[PDB]
């Protein structure tokens, strides 16, 4: 209702006014099926500019951080009713964020059904389960003999709503979930999607075997790009379409302007000779009319010696000179890029011509002297 | 000799009651309001100038009632007196009201008042006190330090903005966002003042971390307008960031390209190429966000007309500029072509990107014959994992000039036994979304027409009526254009071109269309470096004379 005579009853039922002059309320306040203790005190008059509000330690740890907002709302809010509406909203938010600490599943259905279902799959499948039992991860095989993992994240009510499925492979995976469905169902759909993309996989497997793939180093299964190296200090990057892998790829050239140009010309002349019945390599070799090196250098690949902020060599005469003091990063930078970055971060502090801060990549102490 | 007073006597009262509301813009709301209306005020003063110039002072009393109050109110408002020409005109109006030989005291008082207000404009010390005091001692007049002070004032401000940008999420000294908006409003009336340009470029590059827009859209529009008339000359990074923070400004800029291809410079592709390269759109369109929105305005125009040849050519020019700038300035880590052209198979684009400068003139046939095959697959065999439809694969193919126009000329070069796949490509060009029955009927008509044309070419120089027989619909523009390509190609041309052109140019639309066609063709030839000087001179003369009919 509008007035605070029946609306306050209806919208905060478990707040009971103690005093006849309705000034002290005490009781509980509700949020996502959970009641929090709360005790409020007004002045002699109905002004919230000054009021007491005490809570249980349950409620304060959950309204941790938002303390200043609530304190502000005490002073800014006109009526008590609206202040409570706002505090229930606010409370909902603070709970929905830290949903990790605050939950309880319905065991009689849940834990047993999930273990029945993992038995229905087969214990050869399951590879990981989280202590909250929320995330689990299963495995499958290709006919080619490739492992593909699938992460599910489960809610408090597993069979009721959909579980969030996360998978590596590059086409979007679609799983028809029903309330009747279960882990065997989505797993069968996953095996179907695996067998669909077999051809893309074959392509990328053949490439990563018989060629020096360069910068998807140890590439994922999501990865469509393969910067292949050829000759010396020149590369061709190659993006492949999953639905049509054997089809012509997107390819272009990085390196020396004088070496690449005749290659682009030869490509232009031979592109009509592309054929999606052979292999990608077996087509590219006769299209660009050259052979590849099979790992010409395995040790000293092109360790990226670029700014790791601007990703360029040769920024305004400057060289990547400022580096990381770390064995695992060793990442060069520029003065200018790394100065504009460190002057940003909140952690950084500046002496006379020195700034100490965190390396962007590894977050270790790095020093810059202008 | 119609109004001479009425519209102006209304505007007078409007402006005078508005100046009274405004004066001196010492607040927020007077400022925003002045910056809006000022442009019209300028025109009003030009008309007022014309009115007072033609007549004389001190004799006539038409609007002499309140001209004084108007010019005063104007002068003490500095957002008026700093706009493009307002001050110069305001001087003029007071110069007209002066009198050489005052008789009544009113004329002398007026002249004195005029000297007073002029002196206020030019030479009044409304500045800080101690700085005024310091200079007189050193023997400096206002003029010979005003410039440095401004310059040194501007640089200061620019640094502060520069520093506010780097202090993103830092415990110090946040430049109060009120002052940034204030500066943005103050730069607007004086954007054509060269001395401030340093401030603009800093305001646009120093976006800040505030999630709301701290600058107000009166500012973006002024900069945007002024980039396009070439009255400010910023650097490219500034305009790219203006485009990327204010999409309605990129619409108003890409519309200013469509007026360039519709009104002013119809079918002069050299002036369009010059405009596009000089404008920054190609450089700015390396950003995928701006190419998806610039491409969406081209599509809207491609649909409003049902495939106007004038739009197509502009798109071809744009795409050629864009390509060598995507290429030019992204060495490592560039965006993948399915990100600019996200609907088609990337394969197809990767083919159509290959410039025909790079290919021998003889191997163009093979490349086209291959493209045709892959396009036929993409349209007719419309299965999952392909285009959205025929229109999309079309709209791609349209972006790449060179390929689309060489088709007819290669059919003529291989006129004996034309390849059906090329016939398919050509028929597809002039109409997609037809269905095989239509495309087949069109193709067989075209093949018969090609049979007629090879016979006619290997014959002597014949009439134009023999051509109107086979010409004699939904498939007219294809046959028209093929016949024009025949005229330019065959050496039987340059004798009987006029005879066909006059008959074909029924309306003005077909004439304009043919002009456009010929311009596109000469641009294309001169670009690809493919030329037969017969056709060059022929087309130039025809274009010259057809530009007269309009
Ligand atoms: Zn750098
Ligand atoms: Zn590091």
mmCIF file of N, CA and C in Angstrom, chain B residues 16-96:
data_model
loop_
_atom_site.group_PDB
_atom_site.id
_atom_site.type_symbol
_atom_site.label_atom_id
_atom_site.label_comp_id
_atom_site.label_asym_id
_atom_site.label_seq_id
_atom_site.Cartn_x
_atom_site.Cartn_y
_atom_site.Cartn_z
ATOM 1 N N UNK B 16 16.841 40.741 -29.376
ATOM 2 C CA UNK B 16 17.026 41.738 -28.313
ATOM 3 C C UNK B 16 16.515 41.212 -26.974
ATOM 4 N N UNK B 17 15.379 40.527 -26.964
ATOM 5 C CA UNK B 17 14.879 39.947 -25.710
ATOM 6 C C UNK B 17 15.738 38.756 -25.299
ATOM 7 N N UNK B 18 16.464 38.164 -26.244
ATOM 8 C CA UNK B 18 17.354 37.046 -25.892
ATOM 9 C C UNK B 18 18.671 37.565 -25.335
ATOM 10 N N UNK B 19 19.203 38.626 -25.931
ATOM 11 C CA UNK B 19 20.438 39.235 -25.423
ATOM 12 C C UNK B 19 20.198 39.734 -24.014
ATOM 13 N N UNK B 20 19.049 40.337 -23.799
ATOM 14 C CA UNK B 20 18.676 40.776 -22.459
ATOM 15 C C UNK B 20 18.657 39.590 -21.497
ATOM 16 N N UNK B 21 18.158 38.427 -21.928
ATOM 17 C CA UNK B 21 18.131 37.237 -21.050
ATOM 18 C C UNK B 21 19.547 36.792 -20.730
ATOM 19 N N UNK B 22 20.391 36.734 -21.755
ATOM 20 C CA UNK B 22 21.779 36.229 -21.686
ATOM 21 C C UNK B 22 22.704 37.038 -20.788
ATOM 22 N N UNK B 23 22.927 38.275 -21.188
ATOM 23 C CA UNK B 23 24.199 39.000 -21.186
ATOM 24 C C UNK B 23 25.277 38.480 -20.219
ATOM 25 N N UNK B 24 26.471 38.336 -20.812
ATOM 26 C CA UNK B 24 27.815 38.006 -20.276
ATOM 27 C C UNK B 24 28.002 36.559 -19.825
ATOM 28 N N UNK B 25 26.968 35.732 -19.809
ATOM 29 C CA UNK B 25 27.165 34.283 -19.712
ATOM 30 C C UNK B 25 28.089 33.968 -18.560
ATOM 31 N N UNK B 26 27.717 34.412 -17.380
ATOM 32 C CA UNK B 26 28.526 34.192 -16.191
ATOM 33 C C UNK B 26 28.079 32.922 -15.480
ATOM 34 N N UNK B 27 27.192 32.155 -16.085
ATOM 35 C CA UNK B 27 26.594 30.994 -15.434
ATOM 36 C C UNK B 27 26.770 29.817 -16.373
ATOM 37 N N UNK B 28 26.162 28.705 -16.022
ATOM 38 C CA UNK B 28 26.176 27.548 -16.915
ATOM 39 C C UNK B 28 25.152 27.752 -18.036
ATOM 40 N N UNK B 29 23.933 28.162 -17.709
ATOM 41 C CA UNK B 29 22.811 28.038 -18.645
ATOM 42 C C UNK B 29 22.884 29.097 -19.726
ATOM 43 N N UNK B 30 23.283 30.317 -19.388
ATOM 44 C CA UNK B 30 23.558 31.337 -20.398
ATOM 45 C C UNK B 30 24.640 30.857 -21.370
ATOM 46 N N UNK B 31 25.702 30.178 -20.889
ATOM 47 C CA UNK B 31 26.797 29.649 -21.741
ATOM 48 C C UNK B 31 26.279 28.611 -22.738
ATOM 49 N N UNK B 32 25.704 27.527 -22.256
ATOM 50 C CA UNK B 32 25.241 26.516 -23.191
ATOM 51 C C UNK B 32 24.355 27.156 -24.230
ATOM 52 N N UNK B 33 23.447 28.059 -23.822
ATOM 53 C CA UNK B 33 22.422 28.682 -24.698
ATOM 54 C C UNK B 33 23.054 29.587 -25.755
ATOM 55 N N UNK B 34 24.021 30.390 -25.368
ATOM 56 C CA UNK B 34 24.736 31.197 -26.344
ATOM 57 C C UNK B 34 25.401 30.329 -27.420
ATOM 58 N N UNK B 35 26.236 29.368 -27.018
ATOM 59 C CA UNK B 35 26.967 28.463 -27.926
ATOM 60 C C UNK B 35 26.051 27.798 -28.947
ATOM 61 N N UNK B 36 24.814 27.495 -28.577
ATOM 62 C CA UNK B 36 23.803 26.980 -29.525
ATOM 63 C C UNK B 36 23.405 28.031 -30.556
ATOM 64 N N UNK B 37 22.912 29.166 -30.109
ATOM 65 C CA UNK B 37 22.117 30.038 -30.975
ATOM 66 C C UNK B 37 23.023 30.953 -31.780
ATOM 67 N N UNK B 38 24.306 30.912 -31.500
ATOM 68 C CA UNK B 38 25.219 31.973 -31.916
ATOM 69 C C UNK B 38 25.271 32.020 -33.423
ATOM 70 N N UNK B 39 25.226 30.858 -34.060
ATOM 71 C CA UNK B 39 25.418 30.817 -35.506
ATOM 72 C C UNK B 39 24.356 31.664 -36.199
ATOM 73 N N UNK B 40 23.103 31.512 -35.796
ATOM 74 C CA UNK B 40 22.017 32.303 -36.385
ATOM 75 C C UNK B 40 22.221 33.778 -36.094
ATOM 76 N N UNK B 41 22.652 34.091 -34.875
ATOM 77 C CA UNK B 41 22.932 35.472 -34.489
ATOM 78 C C UNK B 41 23.879 36.090 -35.504
ATOM 79 N N UNK B 42 24.889 35.341 -35.886
ATOM 80 C CA UNK B 42 25.855 35.852 -36.859
ATOM 81 C C UNK B 42 25.127 36.266 -38.149
ATOM 82 N N UNK B 43 24.259 35.400 -38.649
ATOM 83 C CA UNK B 43 23.577 35.695 -39.906
ATOM 84 C C UNK B 43 22.690 36.892 -39.755
ATOM 85 N N UNK B 44 22.023 36.949 -38.622
ATOM 86 C CA UNK B 44 21.185 38.102 -38.302
ATOM 87 C C UNK B 44 21.987 39.396 -38.374
ATOM 88 N N UNK B 45 23.220 39.349 -37.910
ATOM 89 C CA UNK B 45 24.020 40.565 -37.916
ATOM 90 C C UNK B 45 24.491 40.872 -39.318
ATOM 91 N N UNK B 46 24.724 39.861 -40.141
ATOM 92 C CA UNK B 46 25.086 40.148 -41.541
ATOM 93 C C UNK B 46 23.931 40.863 -42.237
ATOM 94 N N UNK B 47 22.715 40.374 -42.037
ATOM 95 C CA UNK B 47 21.550 40.994 -42.673
ATOM 96 C C UNK B 47 21.388 42.408 -42.143
ATOM 97 N N UNK B 48 21.551 42.576 -40.832
ATOM 98 C CA UNK B 48 21.475 43.900 -40.210
ATOM 99 C C UNK B 48 22.552 44.809 -40.776
ATOM 100 N N UNK B 49 23.722 44.259 -41.068
ATOM 101 C CA UNK B 49 24.809 45.066 -41.622
ATOM 102 C C UNK B 49 24.411 45.566 -43.000
ATOM 103 N N UNK B 50 23.926 44.655 -43.830
ATOM 104 C CA UNK B 50 23.486 45.028 -45.178
ATOM 105 C C UNK B 50 22.454 46.145 -45.079
ATOM 106 N N UNK B 51 21.536 46.012 -44.131
ATOM 107 C CA UNK B 51 20.454 46.984 -43.969
ATOM 108 C C UNK B 51 20.999 48.352 -43.575
ATOM 109 N N UNK B 52 21.862 48.413 -42.570
ATOM 110 C CA UNK B 52 22.379 49.719 -42.122
ATOM 111 C C UNK B 52 23.423 50.298 -43.074
ATOM 112 N N UNK B 53 24.107 49.462 -43.847
ATOM 113 C CA UNK B 53 25.153 49.946 -44.756
ATOM 114 C C UNK B 53 24.512 50.745 -45.882
ATOM 115 N N UNK B 54 23.516 50.148 -46.536
ATOM 116 C CA UNK B 54 22.868 50.762 -47.707
ATOM 117 C C UNK B 54 22.316 52.145 -47.357
ATOM 118 N N UNK B 55 21.875 52.340 -46.117
ATOM 119 C CA UNK B 55 21.331 53.639 -45.708
ATOM 120 C C UNK B 55 22.363 54.360 -44.848
ATOM 121 N N UNK B 56 21.960 55.489 -44.279
ATOM 122 C CA UNK B 56 22.904 56.313 -43.522
ATOM 123 C C UNK B 56 22.405 56.599 -42.110
ATOM 124 N N UNK B 57 23.304 57.178 -41.322
ATOM 125 C CA UNK B 57 23.126 57.376 -39.882
ATOM 126 C C UNK B 57 22.549 58.756 -39.584
ATOM 127 N N UNK B 58 21.923 58.861 -38.414
ATOM 128 C CA UNK B 58 21.597 60.132 -37.737
ATOM 129 C C UNK B 58 20.458 60.858 -38.449
ATOM 130 N N UNK B 59 20.117 60.412 -39.651
ATOM 131 C CA UNK B 59 19.003 60.989 -40.403
ATOM 132 C C UNK B 59 17.759 60.137 -40.191
ATOM 133 N N UNK B 60 17.932 58.815 -40.184
ATOM 134 C CA UNK B 60 16.802 57.868 -40.221
ATOM 135 C C UNK B 60 16.642 57.217 -38.853
ATOM 136 N N UNK B 61 15.418 56.810 -38.544
ATOM 137 C CA UNK B 61 15.069 56.344 -37.194
ATOM 138 C C UNK B 61 14.342 54.993 -37.235
ATOM 139 N N UNK B 62 14.530 54.209 -38.295
ATOM 140 C CA UNK B 62 13.747 52.975 -38.503
ATOM 141 C C UNK B 62 13.856 52.011 -37.315
ATOM 142 N N UNK B 63 15.058 51.539 -37.007
ATOM 143 C CA UNK B 63 15.288 50.618 -35.881
ATOM 144 C C UNK B 63 16.292 51.209 -34.909
ATOM 145 N N UNK B 64 16.668 52.457 -35.153
ATOM 146 C CA UNK B 64 17.537 53.289 -34.316
ATOM 147 C C UNK B 64 16.987 53.358 -32.890
ATOM 148 N N UNK B 65 15.658 53.155 -32.659
ATOM 149 C CA UNK B 65 15.149 52.880 -31.313
ATOM 150 C C UNK B 65 16.054 52.093 -30.360
ATOM 151 N N UNK B 66 16.471 50.875 -30.699
ATOM 152 C CA UNK B 66 17.197 50.046 -29.726
ATOM 153 C C UNK B 66 18.451 49.404 -30.312
ATOM 154 N N UNK B 67 18.918 49.871 -31.465
ATOM 155 C CA UNK B 67 20.142 49.304 -32.061
ATOM 156 C C UNK B 67 21.290 49.388 -31.049
ATOM 157 N N UNK B 68 21.375 50.513 -30.340
ATOM 158 C CA UNK B 68 22.401 50.704 -29.315
ATOM 159 C C UNK B 68 22.413 49.579 -28.294
ATOM 160 N N UNK B 69 21.283 49.375 -27.622
ATOM 161 C CA UNK B 69 21.192 48.361 -26.567
ATOM 162 C C UNK B 69 21.568 47.000 -27.130
ATOM 163 N N UNK B 70 21.170 46.730 -28.372
ATOM 164 C CA UNK B 70 21.463 45.434 -28.988
ATOM 165 C C UNK B 70 22.963 45.257 -29.117
ATOM 166 N N UNK B 71 23.640 46.264 -29.669
ATOM 167 C CA UNK B 71 25.077 46.119 -29.934
ATOM 168 C C UNK B 71 25.865 46.075 -28.630
ATOM 169 N N UNK B 72 25.394 46.788 -27.613
ATOM 170 C CA UNK B 72 26.047 46.735 -26.296
ATOM 171 C C UNK B 72 25.919 45.333 -25.716
ATOM 172 N N UNK B 73 24.683 44.858 -25.580
ATOM 173 C CA UNK B 73 24.429 43.536 -25.002
ATOM 174 C C UNK B 73 25.311 42.514 -25.711
ATOM 175 N N UNK B 74 25.361 42.602 -27.031
ATOM 176 C CA UNK B 74 26.204 41.711 -27.826
ATOM 177 C C UNK B 74 27.644 41.779 -27.345
ATOM 178 N N UNK B 75 28.177 42.996 -27.263
ATOM 179 C CA UNK B 75 29.622 43.213 -27.025
ATOM 180 C C UNK B 75 30.075 42.701 -25.644
ATOM 181 N N UNK B 76 29.268 42.925 -24.608
ATOM 182 C CA UNK B 76 29.654 42.461 -23.256
ATOM 183 C C UNK B 76 29.478 40.954 -23.085
ATOM 184 N N UNK B 77 28.826 40.288 -24.026
ATOM 185 C CA UNK B 77 28.822 38.839 -23.990
ATOM 186 C C UNK B 77 30.024 38.367 -24.761
ATOM 187 N N UNK B 78 30.949 37.650 -24.123
ATOM 188 C CA UNK B 78 32.173 37.204 -24.791
ATOM 189 C C UNK B 78 32.089 35.894 -25.567
ATOM 190 N N UNK B 79 31.069 35.089 -25.332
ATOM 191 C CA UNK B 79 30.823 33.980 -26.248
ATOM 192 C C UNK B 79 30.290 34.449 -27.569
ATOM 193 N N UNK B 80 29.693 35.623 -27.696
ATOM 194 C CA UNK B 80 29.390 36.202 -29.021
ATOM 195 C C UNK B 80 30.613 36.818 -29.663
ATOM 196 N N UNK B 81 31.387 37.562 -28.896
ATOM 197 C CA UNK B 81 32.436 38.401 -29.461
ATOM 198 C C UNK B 81 33.665 37.605 -29.794
ATOM 199 N N UNK B 82 33.614 36.326 -29.537
ATOM 200 C CA UNK B 82 34.701 35.456 -29.909
ATOM 201 C C UNK B 82 34.358 34.492 -31.002
ATOM 202 N N UNK B 83 33.147 34.510 -31.500
ATOM 203 C CA UNK B 83 32.796 33.615 -32.608
ATOM 204 C C UNK B 83 33.292 34.178 -33.920
ATOM 205 N N UNK B 84 33.383 33.309 -34.903
ATOM 206 C CA UNK B 84 34.071 33.519 -36.195
ATOM 207 C C UNK B 84 34.150 34.961 -36.709
ATOM 208 N N UNK B 85 33.045 35.604 -37.040
ATOM 209 C CA UNK B 85 33.185 36.956 -37.590
ATOM 210 C C UNK B 85 32.315 37.961 -36.853
ATOM 211 N N UNK B 86 31.708 37.560 -35.764
ATOM 212 C CA UNK B 86 30.733 38.417 -35.082
ATOM 213 C C UNK B 86 31.284 39.795 -34.766
ATOM 214 N N UNK B 87 32.489 39.826 -34.231
ATOM 215 C CA UNK B 87 33.144 41.054 -33.773
ATOM 216 C C UNK B 87 33.396 41.999 -34.919
ATOM 217 N N UNK B 88 33.829 41.459 -36.033
ATOM 218 C CA UNK B 88 34.142 42.290 -37.183
ATOM 219 C C UNK B 88 32.869 42.965 -37.703
ATOM 220 N N UNK B 89 31.758 42.263 -37.635
ATOM 221 C CA UNK B 89 30.495 42.806 -38.123
ATOM 222 C C UNK B 89 29.977 43.830 -37.138
ATOM 223 N N UNK B 90 30.066 43.511 -35.857
ATOM 224 C CA UNK B 90 29.668 44.451 -34.791
ATOM 225 C C UNK B 90 30.455 45.750 -34.867
ATOM 226 N N UNK B 91 31.699 45.674 -35.267
ATOM 227 C CA UNK B 91 32.447 46.908 -35.460
ATOM 228 C C UNK B 91 31.779 47.690 -36.574
ATOM 229 N N UNK B 92 31.504 46.997 -37.665
ATOM 230 C CA UNK B 92 30.935 47.628 -38.861
ATOM 231 C C UNK B 92 29.647 48.351 -38.521
ATOM 232 N N UNK B 93 28.784 47.715 -37.737
ATOM 233 C CA UNK B 93 27.481 48.310 -37.431
ATOM 234 C C UNK B 93 27.670 49.609 -36.671
ATOM 235 N N UNK B 94 28.616 49.641 -35.766
ATOM 236 C CA UNK B 94 28.877 50.876 -35.042
ATOM 237 C C UNK B 94 29.575 51.909 -35.915
ATOM 238 N N UNK B 95 30.381 51.485 -36.884
ATOM 239 C CA UNK B 95 30.990 52.441 -37.824
ATOM 240 C C UNK B 95 29.944 53.119 -38.693
ATOM 241 N N UNK B 96 28.860 52.422 -39.018
ATOM 242 C CA UNK B 96 27.785 53.026 -39.819
ATOM 243 C C UNK B 96 27.032 54.067 -38.997
#
